[PDB]
């Protein structure tokens, strides 16, 4: 066979140890999920805007008492208007409170006021993968593989807890001071036992079953991993067009073309992740995540060493000190105004 005796037994033992780890991780998650750390806005100084979206912004803040820096996500309750926007914000907070994994950003505080919802996270100063990727063009296959391995392990963890992530893309992956990934933005994450039906995500990363309004499962995250690996290794994603409607048509087609510099091992992995047929998509078969972890493209990956952060990273971001923002792009700095009247109190009671 492909493995000799020694290798096969080591791999089997490794896989049983994963099961043991995930069983303990589920016990810990459920304790926090069933029985969940506030603060207030005046406890922080505003430093700089780190990113912006439709519903608000992420700000570098400095906590007055301790001097620690944090990333504060601010959501305008009055912008969180649509039904699915509201439930998603409750999902995000509850999931972040309860998870614990080396590649998932750590939530420190959450609170709300008359105008806004706030989630205060660890500040990850190395910047978004997105900007580093756009600046360099594309990552080498070894470098893309180092980042991909962290996503594979993170999804193995999340999916074992019945959590789907639903917004993988380079914009959401921060680089920490050791060059490892921190997944941020759990705005689309959800606990799902089987199917779910919300049409949400980012166009270029949507699995076909989402676009086609079919009830879907955690396999959408494995499709998205295929999109991510392709984009990291090529410099652009596999379904690439100026407008979302054109992107959707390419996704549904079942057609992917690869740069001539992609290795055959990489193309094989990607054709099995970017598989429209759910009975054939890697991550969705009888062998689960092991079809991905044991693929030839990952043959050099030491999964435990990645988890332990003992693999040398491709890139260590430069950091001049606490609160450095040099690895982030600049954004318009807009007022953060808090109304004297409570807005949307009833719809956010649970937050």
């Amino acid at each position: 066979g492909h493995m000799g005796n020694a290798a096969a037994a080591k791999k089997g033992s490794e896989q049983e140890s994963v099961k043991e780890f995930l069983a303990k991780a589920k016990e810990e998650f459920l304790k926090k999920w069933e029985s969940p750390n506030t603060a207030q806005l005046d406890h922080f100084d505003r430093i700089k805007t780190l990113g912006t979206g439709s519903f608000g912004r992420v700000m570098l803040v400095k906590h007055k008492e301790t001097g620690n820096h944090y990333a504060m996500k601010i959501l305008d309750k009055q912008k969180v208007v649509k039904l699915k926007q509201i439930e998603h914000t409750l999902n995000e907070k509850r999931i972040l409170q309860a998870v614990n994994f080396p590649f998932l950003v750590k939530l420190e505080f959450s609170f709300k006021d008359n105008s806004n919802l706030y989630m205060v996270m660890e500040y990850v100063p190395g910047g978004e993968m997105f900007s580093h990727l756009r600046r360099i063009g594309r990552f080498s296959e070894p470098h893309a593989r180092f980042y991909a391995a962290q996503i594979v392990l993170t999804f193995e963890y999340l999916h074992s807890l019945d959590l789907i992530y639903r917004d993988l893309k380079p914009e959401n992956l921060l680089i920490d001071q050791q060059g490892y990934i921190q997944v941020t933005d759990f705005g689309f994450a959800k606990r799902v036992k089987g199917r779910t039906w919300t049409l949400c995500g980012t166009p270029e990363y949507l699995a076909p079953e989402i676009i086609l309004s079919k009830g879907y499962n955690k396999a959408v995250d494995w499709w998205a991993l295929g999109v991510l690996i392709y984009e990291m290794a090529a410099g652009y994603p596999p379904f690439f067009a100026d407008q979302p409607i054109q992107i959707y048509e390419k996704i549904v087609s079942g057609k992917v073309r690869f740069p001539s510099h992609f290795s055959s091992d990489l193309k094989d992995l990607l054709r099995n992740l970017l598989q429209v047929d759910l009975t054939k998509r890697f991550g969705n078969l009888k062998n689960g995540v092991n079809d991905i972890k044991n693929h030839k493209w990952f043959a050099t990956t030491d999964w435990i060493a990645i988890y332990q952060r003992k693999v040398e990273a491709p890139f260590i971001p430069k950091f001049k000190g606490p609160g450095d923002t040099s690895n982030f792009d600049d954004y318009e700095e807009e007022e953060i105004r808090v109304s004297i009247n409570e807005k949307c109190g009833k719809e956010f009671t649970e937050f």
């Binding site: 914009e171 049409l199 995500g201 980012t202 166009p203 270029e204 067009a241």
Partner: peptide, 13 residues
């Protein structure tokens, strides 16, 4: 041709 800038997620397409 395609989108090179940051991509916004859509909550309800």
């Amino acid at each position: 041709a395609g989108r090179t800038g940051r991509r916004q997620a859509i909550h309800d397409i």
